[PDB]
């Protein structure tokens, strides 16, 4: 079939621009908290089956099947509580969606936390949000108070015997704290330093208890998925890329924006049918960073004749990531752009892993030199080998995300680097 | 129709913790580990 | 009897559950490299030097932390493991100081020996190194902190055995470093084992400073008299003079401490 | 932390006087068996050699370390003391 | 910066800092959010509350937080140095932090940083003599789409320009405080000129139910 052109009735995230209200009354008028009591009373297994049949995949980092991920914690009680944790930490460049969600549709997030907690047999839902999002978190807590007061949260959740506690928690300005385990440690009060897996949070997570991690988007879409059957969500993407999606389009575009479209939507249609279109025209474009800065880049020759989904982006070697398109054009220095982007990772590394720690700075220096051209081509393959050394010999995926961009750049823009080097050689 | 999210133009530093305090009364008894701390 | 059959380069081994790849290799006799691991401390996955390969697996695992599952086969002298070791040593020595002729941890350096065995023979690092402010944390322990490879052995020893909780990592990234945020002094009844435990010459003993080198010492095995425990000890002499004193493993008395 | 040196048995002697030369301060001796160290693969062979040659010998046993239970998960428990305060 | 402390007359355990009564109550309410045992999970919010009491974190405040939570002060210095939202050097009155990450950079945050450096007469890193503004360059913040942006104390100002930021800084230099949000016509994040969706109305409390 074909894809794109999603309708405002099949859209999930209304109030996306705050043109309606974001309070309990507006959420009621939009559909939130409808039948949630029966969604609960159906039981967890029902909800997990809906997740599975929905073909839903994680909307944070690497899309992983939410059904299996959440059923990992469908288990008995070893004598400890069991928690849910929503990583509202949204620090990956080009991403501005969770902010809008948390400040416009917080009641959806509350309902999704409740539903996931029931699905897992949990007790409390911590929401770890960036410490820079102060007003957004304040609105979120206002909504949580509205719920606690109404009676949709707490002891008798919505008319059942389920008790649930929703807590908000703030960070202090760290990008690594988006990681499953770094977030957990930061909540526990330690530094934002990840853990080695195993063990997996499903067994030993927050405070040592079974904690399931999730994302704002995923948990907030869960309820609509449940009350719409899964076969609706499922029928908008390819066999495995099913679902709507939030795309943050920025860069050298006329009208940068944040949109919700059908998955498998051509990037070109996403830039034209929305976003106001690239600046200078379709031919001024140079390349794209589709799925966030961590992901590598693809040039125009592929940006055209390409879809937008985990598969058919893996083929182009740039995973979908967070769906944060960063467009560029012929009036740029891709080397300087990606060098600043690697400096980002150099600053945001936590420190412990040898490869990451001692190699992201090496790479930042090498790229700062490559910009001017104070090198010789023999260093490009060395950069490649170093990136490959960092890729899989780390703890978390920050090293992988810092390596992939260099691979993409060296693979699709090598002649520019060689020319810069030759020009430096000429003008010693 | 026009913009609505204009409540945050007047928030203040201690807002979030004031509300966390207001809700501490609605919270439920947390569990226990049988220990004051890991010592 | 709750045991598991594992393979190490093809050879079968019986191991208890919860046992690690490193431990299985040791039970066979093989020995995985180490910088951050020590039998008597908690486990961390920082150095990334224990990385080996599992038959039918794309990613290399950490032998210090990965408990061995049934049926796994472990490839220790494989190209993937060796490339991982080479890269990790490249990174470790990227920002290391060329202080080996000043470093009293000179002929005893695990980093030296592992660079020679499992590491390459040249550098591709043509950039500028870093330097660190050296602390002062007592009259016994000398600190040249531009040699720390951030293994955390000192922090863990202190937190666990000596019950101090005064060492830690302040900062993040390559700008990170170890020690106390203040000029605190580390004077415990056990302060002095951080010296033997630090794989490098970042922590050294001020008394033994510059007096000798390992290949000169003659080593006798004796015991303590200071207390009534009988800690097994090594006395290292040179031309008829006592130069230092070291522990000696006796797992029923002192287990590597003095 | 290497153990490639605890694998072969060794036979050495008792140490004797090692005094100072007046001229230069060097270390002087008269025992010609002070730097004599022999290597064996078995205590039985070591002791047989010692007996053969006619030396009164003391013997020590191979102090092997114990097997240890390690659990990276123990550093994050909800109830125990093994919980670690720094990652 | 530096991750080492040398005691000065401005920073030392003798430096005066205690918690207010209302903030003690807030601390109690915070600690009641974590289980009985595992109460060191409040270090971050407590440090932030101390920053909000005084806009910078002294060694005395660190030791006080440690005394409160019965946690050693090393496990507080670690956090304070790890997380960048903590101020161990005294900040000014308004803490401008400009995103210089690739999106905002190619949408020319460089030019606004130049405008700001020129206007304030001080360069990145340092503060003003009157101790009113502190300027910093910073990484992504959550406004990439409205990329050219700033954060001053806790508010955002997006899509600004040289003239717009100069106007905001003049309003701040006066005794007046502005209102946060995009300063380029657009409201929050919608496409410039209008909408490409949400042109129709929503569905009532019931729809697509099954
Ligand atoms: C450096 C780094 C940053 C990350 N940032 C985020 C993030 O901002 N949001 C997020 O949801 N996940 C982030 N992740 C990965 C999360 O573990 C993952 O998204 C989450 O666990 C999946 O939640 P889901 O069930 O909703 O898919 C990050 C991982 C790394 C290594
Ligand atoms: S890869 Fe880097 S950021 Fe991730 S845990 Fe290791 S040191 Fe920290
Ligand atoms: S620890 Fe000392 S001997 Fe070992 S590599 Fe470093 S400087 Fe050389
Ligand atoms: S000082 Fe020595 S023991 Fe401590 S972390 Fe550094 S290398 Fe390891
Ligand atoms: S010994 Fe395994 S990571 Fe250090
Ligand atoms: S890149 Fe500047 S706000 Fe994200």
Short mmCIF file of C-alpha atoms in Angstrom, two decimals, chain A residues 173-174 191 193 196-198 347-355 357-359 361-362 365-366 369 379 385-386 389-390 392-395, chain C residues 44-48 51 59-60 65-67 84 87-88 90-92 94-95 124-128 130 149-150 169 171-174 176:
data_model
loop_
_atom_site.label_atom_id
_atom_site.label_comp_id
_atom_site.label_asym_id
_atom_site.label_seq_id
_atom_site.Cartn_x
_atom_site.Cartn_y
_atom_site.Cartn_z
CA UNK A 173 21.39 18.51 33.40
CA UNK A 174 22.84 15.28 32.04
CA UNK A 191 25.73 9.51 39.74
CA UNK A 193 26.41 6.08 35.63
CA UNK A 196 26.15 -3.64 33.10
CA UNK A 197 23.35 -5.87 31.85
CA UNK A 198 22.64 -8.48 33.12
CA UNK A 347 30.94 16.69 27.16
CA UNK A 348 28.04 14.34 27.93
CA UNK A 349 30.05 11.15 28.46
CA UNK A 350 29.86 9.92 32.04
CA UNK A 351 33.44 8.68 32.35
CA UNK A 352 33.90 5.07 33.40
CA UNK A 353 34.22 3.08 30.16
CA UNK A 354 37.75 3.30 28.81
CA UNK A 355 36.86 3.39 25.08
CA UNK A 357 36.08 8.13 28.00
CA UNK A 358 39.47 8.22 26.29
CA UNK A 359 38.31 8.03 22.67
CA UNK A 361 37.89 13.27 23.16
CA UNK A 362 40.50 11.81 20.80
CA UNK A 365 40.36 16.58 18.57
CA UNK A 366 40.82 14.71 15.29
CA UNK A 369 41.76 19.27 13.09
CA UNK A 379 44.02 9.58 9.38
CA UNK A 385 39.15 1.96 13.04
CA UNK A 386 38.86 3.98 16.26
CA UNK A 389 36.91 0.07 18.43
CA UNK A 390 34.47 2.23 20.38
CA UNK A 392 30.69 -2.44 20.61
CA UNK A 393 33.24 -2.47 23.45
CA UNK A 394 31.27 -0.07 25.68
CA UNK A 395 28.65 -0.39 28.42
CA UNK C 44 32.71 -3.14 37.92
CA UNK C 45 32.77 -3.08 34.14
CA UNK C 46 34.94 -0.02 33.57
CA UNK C 47 38.29 -1.14 32.15
CA UNK C 48 36.68 -3.15 29.32
CA UNK C 51 36.29 -8.80 26.83
CA UNK C 59 29.02 -8.77 20.67
CA UNK C 60 31.89 -9.43 23.07
CA UNK C 65 30.49 -9.64 35.23
CA UNK C 66 28.73 -12.01 32.81
CA UNK C 67 27.62 -15.19 34.60
CA UNK C 84 39.19 -5.65 21.67
CA UNK C 87 41.81 -1.17 21.19
CA UNK C 88 41.31 -0.94 24.94
CA UNK C 90 45.39 1.87 22.78
CA UNK C 91 42.80 3.95 24.61
CA UNK C 92 44.38 3.40 28.03
CA UNK C 94 46.44 7.40 24.77
CA UNK C 95 46.49 9.82 27.72
CA UNK C 124 48.49 6.20 16.33
CA UNK C 125 47.71 9.01 18.81
CA UNK C 126 49.26 12.20 17.43
CA UNK C 127 47.29 14.58 19.67
CA UNK C 128 47.85 16.31 23.00
CA UNK C 130 46.15 15.72 29.57
CA UNK C 149 43.29 4.63 34.75
CA UNK C 150 39.98 5.08 36.62
CA UNK C 169 35.01 10.30 41.39
CA UNK C 171 33.61 15.14 37.44
CA UNK C 172 32.68 13.38 34.24
CA UNK C 173 34.33 12.57 30.95
CA UNK C 174 38.07 12.65 30.43
CA UNK C 176 37.00 13.26 35.48
#
